[PDB]
Design a protein around this ligand. Structure first.
Ligand SMILES: Nc1ncnc2c1ncn2[C@@H]1O[C@H](CSCC[C@H](N)C(=O)O)[C@@H](O)[C@H]1O
Ligand SMILES: CCn1c(=N)n2c3c(cccc31)CCC2
Length: 265
């Protein structure tokens, strides 16, 4: 069936258990992070932006919790230069397994070398590709289970309050409505130190995203709804950027991406 995304017939939005069953890390990785495609340009945009946030701006500290990491590590590459400890998390178990293969530098794991090299050229080439992946691997401390829709996102796992909370291309997929988007930001706040940083980068006006022929739901947010929901979840925006570049017609109906850096009140 392709009339409605998988797991959305009864409710209207993809169910969380749909991510445990029909989400495949290998195809998600090959589809978006594997010539100079729409996806390659988007990745270059999120990387250049993460380089500005973590290396040019004042976003440094001890703990950075990454929420809904999937099987990806592109989003951590520049943060490992400013954060002493990273905690990668996700709801889908198979994604945490794909991340644990990467921490182990297993041969079965996905090859992030083109992305690592690109980030090294962004950072002025102080180090090479292999030295960079090793610094990130050491910085990743725990691999955790995650549910944004819970007052305690990481269950009973006792973690010190974080200096920053990163969340790339996840909240739109996780939150079925605006109240859930608001409640989920407040829950991420339960991990943040007072005045701690909230970093999000996600699609704009997208009702879906594809994994081959697997349609997955996305909350079609507008720039103003993002600004409004963030402010109302107990945060103050510092920086808000919107680029008009979209994913390929065949994989998503987004009308650009957004990226913000908010601070918890
Ligand atoms: N309720 C929930 N809580 C936490 N993560 C969730 C969730 N529902 C879905 N997700 C996760 O959201 C992710 C969307 S893919 C995002 C992958 C990655 N952060 C990137 O930058 O591309 C999936 O890995 C899925 O497991
Ligand atoms: C990076 C691939 N991908 C992703 N994880 N999300 C996407 C959205 C739109 C387009 C493409 C997307 C919104 C939901 C979450």
């Amino acid at each position: 069936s392709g009339l409605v995304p998988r797991g959305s017939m009864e409710s209207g939005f993809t169910s969380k258990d749909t991510y445990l069953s029909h989400f495949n890390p290998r195809d998600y990785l090959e589809k978006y992070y594997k010539r100079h495609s729409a996806e390659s340009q988007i990745l270059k945009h999120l990387l250049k932006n993460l380089f500005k946030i973590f290396c040019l701006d004042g976003v440094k500290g001890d703990l950075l919790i990454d929420i809904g990491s999937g099987p990806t590590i592109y989003q951590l590459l520049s943060a490992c230069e400013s954060f002493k400890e990273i905690v990668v998390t996700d709801y889908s178990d198979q994604n945490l397994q794909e991340l644990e293969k990467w921490l182990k530098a297993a041969p079965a794991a996905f090859d992030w070398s083109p992305v690592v090299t690109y980030v090294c050229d962004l950072e002025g080439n102080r180090v090479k590709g292999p030295e960079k992946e090793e610094k990130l691997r050491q910085a990743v401390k725990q691999v955790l289970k995650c549910d944004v829709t819970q007052s305690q996102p990481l269950g009973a796992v006792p973690l010190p309050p974080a200096d920053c909370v990163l969340s790339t291309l996840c909240l739109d997929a996780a939150c079925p409505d605006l109240p859930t988007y608001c409640r989920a930001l407040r829950n991420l706040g339960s991990l943040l130190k007072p005045g701690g940083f909230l970093v999000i980068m996600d699609a704009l006006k997208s009702s879906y995203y594809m994994i081959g022929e697997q349609k997955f739901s996305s909350l079609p947010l507008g720039r103003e709804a993002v600004e409004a929901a963030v402010k109302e979840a107990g945060y103050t925006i510092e920086w808000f950027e919107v680029i008009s570049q979209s994913y390929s017609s065949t994989m998503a109906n987004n009308e650009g991406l957004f990226s913000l850096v908010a601070r918890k009140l």
